[PDB]
Amino acid sequence: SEVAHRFKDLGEENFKALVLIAFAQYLQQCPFEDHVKLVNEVTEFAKTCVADESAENCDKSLHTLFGDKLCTVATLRETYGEMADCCAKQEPERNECFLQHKDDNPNLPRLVRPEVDVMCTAFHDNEETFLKKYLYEIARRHPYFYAPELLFFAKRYKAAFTECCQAADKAACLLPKLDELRDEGKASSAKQRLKCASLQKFGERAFKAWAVARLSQRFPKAEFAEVSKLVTDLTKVHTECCHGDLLECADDRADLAKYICENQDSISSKLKECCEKPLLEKSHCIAEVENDEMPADLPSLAADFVESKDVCKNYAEAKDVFLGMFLYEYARRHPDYSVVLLLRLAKTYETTLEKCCAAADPHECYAKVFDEFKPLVEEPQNLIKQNCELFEQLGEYKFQNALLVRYTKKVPQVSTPTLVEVSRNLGKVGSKCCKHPEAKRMPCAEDYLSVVLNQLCVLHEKTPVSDRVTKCCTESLVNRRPCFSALEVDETYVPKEFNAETFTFHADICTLSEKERQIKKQTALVELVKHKPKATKEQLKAVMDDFAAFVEKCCKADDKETCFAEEGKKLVAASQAA
Ligand SMILES: CC(=O)Nc1nc(C)c(-c2cnc(F)c(NS(=O)(=O)c3sc(C)nc3C)c2)s1
Q1: Three-state secondary structure of 185-213
Q2: Residue 178, ligand 1, Cβ within 6 A
Q3: Cα angle: 247, vertex 249, 250; to 5 degrees
Q4: Residue 576 covered by a domain
Q5: Are 479 and 518 within one domain?
Q6: Residue 145 CB–ligand 1 contact under 6 Å
Q7: Count of domains for the chain
Q8: Centre of ligand 1 from the C-alpha of residue 37, in Å
Q9: 3 state SS of 125
Q10: Ligand 1 centre and the CA of 117: distance in Å?
Q11: Which atom of ligand 1 is nearest the CA belonging to 153?
Q12: Does residue 176 have its Cβ closer than 6 Å to ligand 1?
């Protein structure tokens, strides 16, 4: 019995919560009530298997069980659409099918926190139903959310309301704390979507090379064997989470934290505070703790990998082992390099070792390897440096605007809302990284730009409209950022004609908050670029501020919502003819 095994290992609480997530990630449109009932029935069924493990259905797989249950609500499909297709199959084809229909951009109401008092009301009226609400609503919008990690956000959510609902100022305690988990959640989500896109699109080998490079950077005093044991455990975990095997994912993550903490002196000296923490806090802490000190007496890389005469020899004996070794060795020496740069280095290392060990003289040609590594290292360096000056010059909002212009011209066929969600997230790179010294930027900046770009890939993949996004997204996971960066103004694209709809907005704008008031201005800024990409110097910004003045001036003109309609049809024609 699988469900009884997981039940025992995870505890009732976590079993419930993890099962709710799985369902919300597979049936995103389905009502909250339906999912909660279904979960209760599964839990009810689980308890019986824990009692007598030979009870009728207790030897079926978790997907068999969980899919049969989901399917009691899915297999009708007027509003559900195409998810009764998956219910006409048997496992393991059904799970493939559910997975395949995960929606990165579900048409769901874009989510708005009600007042603090009403929330404390519900939190105290029934605290269970309130917290299940948070899981359901985050999970169904983030169907790849790292499920063990979603339980931690859930615990911190609960503690916020526990502390703040007993405050003299419920709002001041709770606004900052809920603002934190919101931002932290989105970031958490975007990262996890990259881990799954790698496993799902590029295959486990590609993911193995990622964690080898990351854990080596983080645990550089650890031996290779050790680093490898960890990469193997960590790969499995994420494979299971990304393939909807969430109970086993959570169980294995806990095992891995437990092992890590029981082999600390073999891994790192920065693990003290993490391993003294309640179990969800623990895995979170481990997953993202500061890199350890780099050992003193490391010999030059070049000796084992370039100067040595046994390279082609040793390479051949075990290529994947030798290449991981290289990656291990190059990474632990460079916590100042982005992960994707380390992976670019190891690919170049690989293809050089491939042609040189065939040709006339191995020793001679592969000795040059390090000059092939040169340009690859400096291209990110100059970019992160160049884009951080710009940020300090312009500040965040204008830094976002600049990249919007940049990216719109890059890939003008892309949906305007997407460009807007992507360019803003790209622009967040400045406040996040530039802060740091130059020896900590590149990983901060480039691996984050990898994540945001991945977001552009998945949103576009839904309905492809741009050949260049497809190419840049399908080619090499690791070379995506150089790819997009390399793109210039698209000349094939023929501009969009304006019309009496794309801009003529209403009076609700004034009551909107700073942020939404920015996004609308940014949405219009994209359309101005789509409609005339070329001549777009300061003539863009001279019109964008004429929208800004227009909005502000017309907002505060005591008008019965009429100045907008009147003075709005004007400036579209005016900003066109300009
Ligand atoms: C129609 C409707 O009522 N939808 C909503 N359902 C839930 C559970 C909402 C919600 C409840 N409590 C919060 F506290 C936040 N906080 S938040 O919006 O800022 C957060 S927190 C987080 C991890 N993501 C977001 C978007 C959001 S709003």
Answers
A1: HHHHHHHHHHHHHHHHHHCHHHHHHHHHH
A2: yes
A3: 70
A4: no
A5: no
A6: no
A7: 6
A8: 22
A9: helix
A10: 14
A11: 23
A12: no
Same domain, 370 and 431: no
Q: Is residue 575 part of a domain?
A: no
First CA to last CA distance, the chain: 72
d(CA 117, CA 167): 11
Are 207 and 159 in the same domain?
A: no
Cβ 398 under 6 angstroms from ligand 1? no
* 484 and 386 within one domain: yes
Question: CA-CA distances (angstroms) from residue 348 to 110, 126, 253, 370, 549?
Answer: 44, 58, 33, 10, 52
Is 448:433 a contact under the CB 8 Å cutoff? yes
Picking from 103, 122, 138, the residue at the C-terminal end of a domain is 103
- Whether ligand 1 lies within 6 angstroms of the CB of 258 is answered as no
> Considering only CA atoms, which residue is closest to atom 4 of ligand 1?
111
- The torsion of the CA quartet 378, 383, 384, 385, rounded to 10 degrees, works out to 90
Q: How far is the CA of 142 from the centre of ligand 1 (A)?
A: 13
Q: Quote the tokens at residue 503.
A: 């801009």
Residue 476: inside a domain: yes
Please name the method used to determine this structure: X-ray
| CATH assignment at residue 406 | 1.10.246.10
Domain for residue 574, yes or no?
A: no
Take atom 22 of ligand 1 and give the residue whose Cα is closest. Answer: 182
CA 213/CA 566 separation, integer angstroms: 59
Domain residues for the domain of 213 are: 201-292
